[PDB]
Nucleic acid binder design. Sequence first.
RNA 1: GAGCCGGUAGCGGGCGUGGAUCCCUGGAUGUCCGAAUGGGGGAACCCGGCCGGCGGGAACGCCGGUCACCGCGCUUUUGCGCGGGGGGAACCUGGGGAACUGAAACAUCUCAGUACCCAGAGGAGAGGAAAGAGAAAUCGACUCCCUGAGUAGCGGCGAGCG
RNA 2: GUGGUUCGUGGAGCCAUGGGGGAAUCUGGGCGGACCACCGCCUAAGGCUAAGUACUCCGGGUGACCGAUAGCGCACCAGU
RNA 3: GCGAGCUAGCCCUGGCCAGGGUGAAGCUGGGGUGAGACCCAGUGGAGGCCCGAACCGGUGGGGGAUGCAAACCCCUCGGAU
RNA 4: GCGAAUGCCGGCAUGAGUAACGAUAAAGAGGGUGAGAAUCCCUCUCGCCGUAAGCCCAAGGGUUCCUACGCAAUGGUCGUCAGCGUAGGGUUAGGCGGGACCUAAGGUGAAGCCGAAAGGCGUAGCCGAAGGGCAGCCGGUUAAUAUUCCGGCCCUUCCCGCAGGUGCGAUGGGGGGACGCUCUAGGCUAGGGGGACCGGAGCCAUGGACGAGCCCGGCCAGAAGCGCAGGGUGGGAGGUAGGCAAAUCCGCCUCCCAACAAGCUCUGCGUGGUGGGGAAGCCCGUACGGGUGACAACCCCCCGAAGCCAGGGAGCCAAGAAAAGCCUCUAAGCACAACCUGCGGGAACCCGUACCGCAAACCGACACAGGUGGGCGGGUGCAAGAGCACUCAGGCGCGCGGGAGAACCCUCGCCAAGGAACUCUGCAAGUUGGCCCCGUAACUUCGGGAGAAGGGGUGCUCCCUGGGGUGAUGAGCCCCGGGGAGCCGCAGUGAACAGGCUCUGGCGACUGUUUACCAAAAACACAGCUCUCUGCGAACUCGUAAGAGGAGGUAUAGGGAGCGACGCUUGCCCGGUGCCGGAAGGUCAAGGGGAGGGGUGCAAGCCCCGAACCGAAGCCCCGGUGAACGGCGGCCGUAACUAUAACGGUCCUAAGGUAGCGAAAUUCCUUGUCGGGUAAGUUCCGACCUGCACGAAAAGCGUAACGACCGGAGCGCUGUCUCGGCGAGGGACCCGGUGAAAUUGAACUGGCCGUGAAGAUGCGGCCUACCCGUGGCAGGACGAAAAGACCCCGUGGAGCUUUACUGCAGCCUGGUGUUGGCUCUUGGUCGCGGCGCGGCUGGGGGCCUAACCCUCGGAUGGGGGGACAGCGCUUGGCGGGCAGUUUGACUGGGGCG
Lengths: 46, 173
Amino acid sequence: MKRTYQPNNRKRAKTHGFRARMKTKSGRNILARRRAKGRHQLTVSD
Amino acid sequence: QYRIIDFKRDKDGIPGRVATIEYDPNRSANIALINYADGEKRYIIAPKNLKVGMEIMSGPDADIKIGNALPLENIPVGTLVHNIELKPGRGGQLVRAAGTSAQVLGKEGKYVIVRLASGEVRMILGKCRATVGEVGNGGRTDKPFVKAGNKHHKMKAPNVRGVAMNAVDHPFG
RNA sequence: GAGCCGGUAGCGGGCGUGGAUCCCUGGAUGUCCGAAUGGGGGAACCCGGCCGGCGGGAACGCCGGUCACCGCGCUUUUGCGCGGGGGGAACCUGGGGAACUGAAACAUCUCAGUACCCAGAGGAGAGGAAAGAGAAAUCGACUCCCUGAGUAGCGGCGAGCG
RNA sequence: GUGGUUCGUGGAGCCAUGGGGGAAUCUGGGCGGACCACCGCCUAAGGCUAAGUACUCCGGGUGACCGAUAGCGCACCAGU
RNA sequence: GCGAGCUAGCCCUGGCCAGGGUGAAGCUGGGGUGAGACCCAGUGGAGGCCCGAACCGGUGGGGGAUGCAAACCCCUCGGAU
RNA sequence: GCGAAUGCCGGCAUGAGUAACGAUAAAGAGGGUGAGAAUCCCUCUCGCCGUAAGCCCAAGGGUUCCUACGCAAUGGUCGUCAGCGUAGGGUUAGGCGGGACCUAAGGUGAAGCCGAAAGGCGUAGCCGAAGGGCAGCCGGUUAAUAUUCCGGCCCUUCCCGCAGGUGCGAUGGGGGGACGCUCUAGGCUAGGGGGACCGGAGCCAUGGACGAGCCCGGCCAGAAGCGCAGGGUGGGAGGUAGGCAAAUCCGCCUCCCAACAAGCUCUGCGUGGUGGGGAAGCCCGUACGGGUGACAACCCCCCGAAGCCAGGGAGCCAAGAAAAGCCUCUAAGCACAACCUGCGGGAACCCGUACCGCAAACCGACACAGGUGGGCGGGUGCAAGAGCACUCAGGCGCGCGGGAGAACCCUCGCCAAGGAACUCUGCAAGUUGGCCCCGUAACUUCGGGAGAAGGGGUGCUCCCUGGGGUGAUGAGCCCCGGGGAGCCGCAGUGAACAGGCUCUGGCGACUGUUUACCAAAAACACAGCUCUCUGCGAACUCGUAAGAGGAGGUAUAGGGAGCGACGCUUGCCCGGUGCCGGAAGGUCAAGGGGAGGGGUGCAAGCCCCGAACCGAAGCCCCGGUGAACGGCGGCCGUAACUAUAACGGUCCUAAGGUAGCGAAAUUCCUUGUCGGGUAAGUUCCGACCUGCACGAAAAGCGUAACGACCGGAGCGCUGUCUCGGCGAGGGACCCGGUGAAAUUGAACUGGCCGUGAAGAUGCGGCCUACCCGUGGCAGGACGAAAAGACCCCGUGGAGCUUUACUGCAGCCUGGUGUUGGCUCUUGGUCGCGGCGCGGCUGGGGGCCUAACCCUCGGAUGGGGGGACAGCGCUUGGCGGGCAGUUUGACUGGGGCG
């Protein structure tokens, strides 16, 4: 059926992961956004 | 086999021996390993002729011995060439398997005349070089891609075309 | 000032007026990530020089400590010793910077120098002793509140801005 | 050739500058809104400067403010 | 700001196409002429080539329509170095 | 202050005890446990797999895995069962995988390069993998782990010591690891098969046979020593005008040994010696059986790989990735202590394992007949083969069971007699379907259209005969004819997998590719043609300036394009338009450059307006331009006993349709008129051709082969149809367990003929009219779905278009700038047709060259262009490439009018 979910450790991870977000302006942005703003955890945390 | 190599001599007094027939797949040029004196080599131009049994070179000196090549300065008039040495040492300055090279059809001071292989005419310059001899491309033309599409087999873009499209898509398009 | 081992009330055991529980303030530890900065990296993991005990090395040899990123001055010598950088709800100036919508269309205009993004200072920045203002030869830092005034005035002199 | 200014090209200045010419050191040199005479003001083209206004994460006070579909959405193993 | 673990591509690097059929270049030999053209016979094994599994697809009909399912089941079909 | 917003939130009823149990691969019986078992455990019949419904490696998910307790809810019923609850416990590695090694894409990235800032790029080096590389295997052992735990057998790297050895000693160099595809020799395990030849546990019941009888098996792994087996290179000297920046390496030339020689990396024997070994099995559960002791056996011939040796060999073209090891060596130290070796002792980590894993544990929100990558995948039978029917090992019976068999939908089976007429349509289905032999038409680009079309064969028995693997060849096996005789059934690929064929036409050549959830086509794609911009630092595409792309390409090339094999053939017009060329003449921006006027000025002055002339592209004007846009006439007369026409007369146009074709899918008058096909034929197909409106390049006529394309016809055959009529399995119906769903104001809701806003159960008159239900059948409740997509209306919105409006991107362009020298020159001007001079200032031609840029070619120097130009500022211009707005009202429907 091929949905769109097949997760890929390697993938998903990579792609998304503390770092990256960081590395980025943007990413970083929102991130520290989320952080306070909301609490929670985060991607990679995932 | 996905690679380049030589294209412009500028170390001479060297012994030019016609390496061999390594007809080559990568630029419409068919060249053979050119064996130099020391032993240092080079898949060199494909300027047709100069039989396997190598036997050539060039030089600040001379030696029209078909193929081979020197500066404009050092060159006859009424002569057919390639290794299009445009600017001062810019190595090759044209004629790629483009058999019909250029013909020092008249030179002038630090300026030598050239029949624009491609399809026009004007002048080069001083030392500027270029090796006579033909090309090599056996009319590298024609040949049928029959009931299939050589193309594809191209590895060479089916970058296919269109023009009629349904849209209003790509540059001047 | 005389009760306690946190919200757990329960089992099993215990500290205490020859000043416990806890309230304060200044402490020493502060494992791994994170600007990370020793090096690599899909964070919270895996890798290197110097010192280090010497350590089980039962008649056989390791973690710990450490150290070190890079842009800043410059005692330059072979450069040794200082600052930064990362944050941070809101507020601050600079750098850059828009359509909606009003004008009962919409090109001028408006929303605005707003919303957003960026950089950066602070606990506040902003700004700040005048080649200023205006004209009574009158006034004097900058800022902010009221007022001046929805006036003088800007304009497809229209909506508005002011 | 743009800016800011109430100024939307305007009789339209001051200050700020994108390009090109490129003065003076006190009878110097801008200014008082095109310009000009005379009067009157000011002295630039470097810098530092607390206080008077702004903002609530924090702590307190107070409520013709609420009461569990109201109040921050979330009165307690919720930005879960 | 957020995304190619959707899909269209493009770069890099591996894996994969059960069996069978058709029989061009060639090379071997023989063939009237100068050599040959060129003929034939053998060998030979190409082709986005044929017949067909897995695999890729999803016309043509059947079911299904608060389904098994927000595209699937059935018969059928094309591609198959 | 609330019915009331298809309102929000929460509960709660509906339909409704009807609809569903997630594949029609079925079960049934005996015992056992339990409070209670169709749904659990043992056992015995039975059905479904079997290329899977097998084990395996991955990825993903992470305790789901075992064991003892337990069922409240999740398990679409139960439930003592669980991949559910609580509790305890389980997965260990120098040699397996990941790192402690290597790089391509790509990503990072000190230096370097450009941005308003954030940022962009990016060398070397680093990150980066089932690509490279690397040192093991078989058995046992628990409730779970296992190449890790046991044990038996096989190794590797580092370190210290000594023993022996030799210029060791970088990674800088060189080989070097290193590779495409299609195909195939030689050899060998995996794997399979026959053995009654060896071992052993019960048999035979029945008619028969104790017999080469039935049933199990007769293997797995290994130091090197060792013969089948290949598998990779040659051997010395010297010169090294000297390279691979530095010398001995390898590269290149010369003379000798230049073999089936010798060389160093996998299979067989084996065999050290170990294990396994089923059928046991006295103690013991004689049964959740098996844990563990006889003895086992331990052998031969047969078939044989789609990747085992191996980096093979042969062919071919589109001509197949980079860093550990091996040898050469500088720095450099060893050179009685550096590296190679030998023996002996010493050292060896970090994190990964359970079980699921063509899946209820993975994605689809669910135990959803959806998808998901690699490994042999057992046999018997078909010509072969992971296709097929039955079954091996192992897996499972779909998680709802009984019971009736009505209509009715599903899936499937059958028919006489006719046999498409059914109908838009042979849509479906049915014919036909497999191998061998015979036999094959029009046409052809001679390859093919052929599997064409059309027959005939196939089974099991015995006889004599010929072949290729069988180490000679002599129980063994295979391809095969042969021909003779003979036996049976309706049938002899017996079942199962398996073209219906033909005749014709149109388009597109063809294999293709594409609109995922309608459409695979005449749509794009093409191999092939033609115009065509471009000389490199290209031209176009992204980009704010760097820069990449292009392309390490270089005119047999790179980009722009309209058609889209091949054949035949593409004619007529450049008045407008785009463009290419021209640039003498008009024009005209910024600008130079002065007459002259103006304001204030006692006055020198001090600000503007300023115009004669010189002045850019552009535009105007001349020409060239059609596989550039685009266009390519009208009517009157005339031999025509009747009709254009052979000719003739003209008005306008840039010429004014040519060759081929024609009622074509461009022809509405039309089912045009003639012909054929037929019982009639508005589809076809041929021919005319007054072509309502073909036409050569978005080609034109045709064209073999080719198509899940479209349309036309014939045989073949079937319930497609003349109505069908029977039947088989599945719901529907009756039982038990569970138990939804949109819509709905509310309701005990009849027909009539009339009516109302003009298509009424509810209003009037009338006629039938008991109360409820279940299996049904669709008509009405203007039924359900959705605030019509068709419509108009809002001076709503969003996409594409051009001579719409404006504006920007880019491009061309005058003057100006860091853009410096030297000379050759003509023009203006005012002063003193003129000439002499003079200041003024305008045009222009030259190597140079010191910026600039580029250049490189091995260093910073040379080289080339050079006042360019890049590039900054203002000018002007093109400019739908893009961005933003706009494009009225009326309207007895919007529009056209």
